[PDB]
Design an enzyme around this catalytic site. Sequence first.
Site, PDB file in Angstrom:
ATOM      1  N   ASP A  15      25.254  31.859  41.226  1.00  0.00           N
ATOM      2  CA  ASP A  15      26.622  31.310  41.572  1.00  0.00           C
ATOM      3  C   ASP A  15      26.619  30.269  42.706  1.00  0.00           C
ATOM      4  OD1 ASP A  15      26.450  32.915  43.850  1.00  0.00           O
ATOM      5  OD2 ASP A  15      27.801  34.531  43.124  1.00  0.00           O
ATOM      6  N   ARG A  29      29.583  26.940  45.970  1.00  0.00           N
ATOM      7  CA  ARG A  29      29.702  28.326  45.529  1.00  0.00           C
ATOM      8  C   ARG A  29      30.769  28.330  44.485  1.00  0.00           C
ATOM      9  NH1 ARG A  29      30.730  32.818  43.872  1.00  0.00           N
ATOM     10  NH2 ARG A  29      30.351  34.829  45.010  1.00  0.00           N
ATOM     11  N   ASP A  34      31.210  36.378  40.737  1.00  0.00           N
ATOM     12  CA  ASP A  34      30.171  36.921  41.618  1.00  0.00           C
ATOM     13  C   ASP A  34      29.037  37.268  40.717  1.00  0.00           C
ATOM     14  OD1 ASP A  34      28.981  37.712  44.025  1.00  0.00           O
ATOM     15  OD2 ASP A  34      29.757  39.837  43.791  1.00  0.00           O
ATOM     16  N   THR A  35      27.929  36.559  40.878  1.00  0.00           N
ATOM     17  CA  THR A  35      26.714  36.913  40.164  1.00  0.00           C
ATOM     18  C   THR A  35      25.898  37.880  41.047  1.00  0.00           C
ATOM     19  OG1 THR A  35      25.600  34.823  41.039  1.00  0.00           O
ATOM     20  CG2 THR A  35      26.476  34.750  38.718  1.00  0.00           C
ATOM     21  N   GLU A  37      22.801  39.186  43.213  1.00  0.00           N
ATOM     22  CA  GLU A  37      21.759  38.484  44.028  1.00  0.00           C
ATOM     23  C   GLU A  37      20.466  38.540  43.206  1.00  0.00           C
ATOM     24  OE1 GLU A  37      22.716  36.935  46.782  1.00  0.00           O
ATOM     25  OE2 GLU A  37      24.809  37.644  46.610  1.00  0.00           O
ATOM     26  N   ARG A  75      30.062  25.983  52.403  1.00  0.00           N
ATOM     27  CA  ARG A  75      29.838  25.742  50.974  1.00  0.00           C
ATOM     28  C   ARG A  75      31.103  25.226  50.354  1.00  0.00           C
ATOM     29  NH1 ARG A  75      27.575  31.670  49.207  1.00  0.00           N
ATOM     30  NH2 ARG A  75      29.802  32.060  49.772  1.00  0.00           N
TER      31      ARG A  75
END
Length: 129
Positions: A15, A29, A34-35, A37, A75
Site C-alpha cells: 500500500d 500511501r 490496509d495491506t 506488512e 506521505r
Amino acid sequence: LHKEPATLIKAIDGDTVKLMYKGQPMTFRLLLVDTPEFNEKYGPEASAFTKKMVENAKKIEVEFDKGQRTDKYGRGLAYIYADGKMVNEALERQGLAKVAYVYKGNNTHEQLLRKAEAQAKKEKLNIWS
Ligand SMILES: Cc1cn([C@H]2C[C@H](OP(=O)(O)O)[C@@H](COP(=O)(O)O)O2)c(=O)[nH]c1=O
Ligand SMILES: [Ca+2]
C-alpha cells in the site's frame, strides 16, 4: 476528483509506492486500504501485486481526495491508477487489503472499495481464505 500525472520511482509494499509527482519524489500511501506488512501473512503477495501493477503500467496517475493530501509522515494520500485501473480497488477485489483508515472528508471511493472487498470475501480470496 481528478487524475494527475506521476511516474514510478520504486515499488515499496502493498500500500505504499514511491512516485515522482510535480517533479518531486514522494512516498504515496494508498487511501482507504490496509495491506499486511511484508513480514505478515499475505504481505509478500500484496507487495508483489502492487509492484506488478505499477511496474507494468504505461501511465501512472494520482488522484487526491477532498481532504488531507499528506499524512503526518509526509506521505501523499491518494488513489493510484495504473493504465486507468485503481490499485486501491484492485487490492480490495483480490483479497490483498482491508478497507481501513476511512477518515471523514477523504472517503470518496469508500463504497466502491467496500463493494470490491465484499466480492473478494464472497470468493474467499487470500486474506478472506
Ligand atoms: C491511510 C492513512 C494512514 N494514516 C496514518 C494512520 C496510522 O498512523 P499510525 O502510524 O500512528 O498507526 C498510519 C497507518 O499507515 P500504515 O498502514 O502505512 O502503517 O498512517 C493517515 O493518517 N491517513 C490515512 O489516510
Ligand atoms: Ca499497511
